[PDB]
Amino acid sequence: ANTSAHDFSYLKFVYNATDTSSEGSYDYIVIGGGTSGCPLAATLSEKYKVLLLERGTIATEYPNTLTADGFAYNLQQQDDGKTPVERFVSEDGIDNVRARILGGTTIINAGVYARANISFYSQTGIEWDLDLVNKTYEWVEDAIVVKPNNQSWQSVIGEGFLEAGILPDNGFSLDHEAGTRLTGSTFDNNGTRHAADELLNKGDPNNLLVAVQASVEKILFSSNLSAIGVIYTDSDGNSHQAFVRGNGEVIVSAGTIGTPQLLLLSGVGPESYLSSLNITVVQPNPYVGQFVYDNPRNFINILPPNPIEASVATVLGIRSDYYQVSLSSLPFSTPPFSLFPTTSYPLPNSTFAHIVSQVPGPLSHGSVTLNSSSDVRIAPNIKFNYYSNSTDLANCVSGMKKLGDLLRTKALEPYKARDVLGIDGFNYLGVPLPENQTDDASFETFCLDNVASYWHYHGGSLVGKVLDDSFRVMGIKALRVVDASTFPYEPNSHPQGFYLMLGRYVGLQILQERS
């Protein structure tokens, strides 16, 4: 991509769910207009009639989702039930967010773009067409990814990472590789956010209908079981149904949280569990909503004596055991929800730099369960079980030690408040790295007590547990699942790139079958 305005041309075929027919018929129904849903929708409409169903509204309604500068704003904004950010708390007690908007989490994220680690393909076991994977990345990148310009704070952390030993220097690259690099962004060089919603512009406007403020509450089934259609409600509280045509399919792309939720409500999940809630079992499947993962975030905040310019994350320090990045920010009197793990967290009075490490995997996991057994608009229960696996914890320790090395660099020295020898010359917001304390146990305590969400949560409808190699729900015809719920491990440090590619890639697979 180059600099241009967010392209809203697709609005010519976006309708409020209140204005759709009571009973619809399409070749394809895509539930959830997010990261995978949008390009899958657009792709299938090249040839067939597609209905895309999104519970949120359109991003024009929320202007702060449209700029690089607006990132904190949407997180700070209070959740009223219609806003683009939906707040929740895991049962672990860590604050967290998901999207509720057309374009999905790409409309609210930090804009970091990367391709999957090339070892990911062989690790899964799926026979990926790697040529086509690449062409599909190229298609996303041409539409919404730029090579970012220089930002001074990112250039400092760039020199710090090299100095601290995060080698080699990869230059500018979109590939997930060991070492330091400038990567891509879906924020353009004029501050404008580009997102999955713009990929709708690649669709055929006479094949694709997008319905917004559509809350999909049930998948509909025949009595050789098949998905036949969906029930959705509109903003007026009225019910609508939509059915698939011969050889067409329902695709669930409701995300890590919404997919298991929808499947469970539709009677696809653990049998004795669904029976305890008086839901009719259509397909017993023990793994619907199991193996849900959230990569932990651990961080420090430095307050420099001189002001620093605000920046979006573009520069990455990759090792096999920890993925590091940094953001610099203006001060605020209102906390951006889930930037810090709870609400009782000190407020910065000046510019600060948020310096962050991510645990790969992770190995720890929990579940998504129903809270309401009938209402999709009531959030499900989610538990991540942060640091129940000891390999996760060790990896956090390693990452935190690397952050110490980063803070000892000459590159970071001018941002110290006091010119002493140690890292206590920095002023901090919140908890410093264990001060003077060298041994592993101090880091472990730091990791466990100050963990945040990295927001890259995945799983709950896994390939191999619920899905086959082609993303079909096992035992059920004409049903697929395509979003972040499909994999038990991260494809790289920043997964939007992979899930954008996956929306289209699965679409092309489907279109090849129809040939």
Ligand X SMILES: *[C@@H]1O[C@H](CO)[C@@H](O[C@@H]2O[C@H](CO)[C@@H](O)[C@H](O)[C@H]2NC(C)=O)[C@H](O)[C@H]1NC(C)=O
Query: Catalytic positions, please?
Result: 456, 494
32 binds, among ligand X, ligand NAG, ligand FAD, none (CB under 5 to 8 A by kind): ligand FAD
Q: Quick check: 258 binds ligand FAD (CB under 6 A)?
A: yes
Q: Where are the alpha helices (DSSP H) in 45-113?
A: 71-76
Binding-site residue numbers for substrate are 454
Q: Which of 64, 67, 155, 427 forms a contact with ligand NAG (CB under 6 A)?
A: 155
499 binds, among ligand NAG, ligand FAD, ligand X, none (CB under 5 to 8 A by kind): ligand FAD
User: What would the two tokens of residue 250 be?
Assistant: 């329902």
Angle between helices 390-408 and 152-163 (to 10 degrees): 110
Q: Quick check: 181 binds ligand FAD (CB under 6 A)?
A: no
Q: Is the dihedral of CA 26, 106, 178, 437 positive or negative?
A: negative
Q: Which of 417, 413, 428, 403 is nearest to 349 (CA)?
A: 428
Residue 28 Cα distances to 52, 280, 318, angstroms: 8, 25, 39
Q: Quick check: 371 binds ligand NAG (CB under 6 A)?
A: yes
Q: Quick check: 108 binds ligand FAD (CB under 6 A)?
A: yes
Site track for ligand NAG across 346-365, x = CB under 6 A: -----------------x--
In eight-state DSSP terms, residue 257 is H
In this structure, are residues 75 and 96 in contact, taking their beta carbons and an 8 Å threshold? Answer: no
Distance CA 141, CA 194 (A): 11
Binding-site residue numbers for FAD are 35-36, 54-55, 105, 109-112, 216, 455-456, 484, 495-496
Q: Quick check: 463 binds ligand FAD (CB under 6 A)?
A: no
Q: Which of 497, 443, 375 is nearest to 110 (CA)?
A: 497
Q: Quick check: 53 binds ligand FAD (CB under 6 A)?
A: yes
Site track for ligand NAG across 176-195, x = CB under 6 A: -xx-----------------
Distance CA 96, CA 384 (A): 11
Q: Smallest distance from the beta carbon of 484 to ligand X, in angstroms?
A: 29
Number of residues that bind ligand FAD (CB under 6 A): 43
Strand pairing report for 85-89 and 95-99: antiparallel
CB atoms within 10 A of CB 281: 15
Q: Quick check: 55 binds ligand FAD (CB under 6 A)?
A: yes
Q: Quick check: 260 binds ligand FAD (CB under 6 A)?
A: no
Q: Quick check: 389 binds ligand NAG (CB under 6 A)?
A: yes
Distance CA 266, CA 221 (A): 9
Q: Quick check: 32 binds ligand FAD (CB under 6 A)?
A: yes
> What residue ranges bind ligand NAG (CB under 6 A)?
115, 117, 119-120, 123, 130-131, 134, 150, 155, 175, 177-178, 318, 320, 363, 371, 381, 389-391
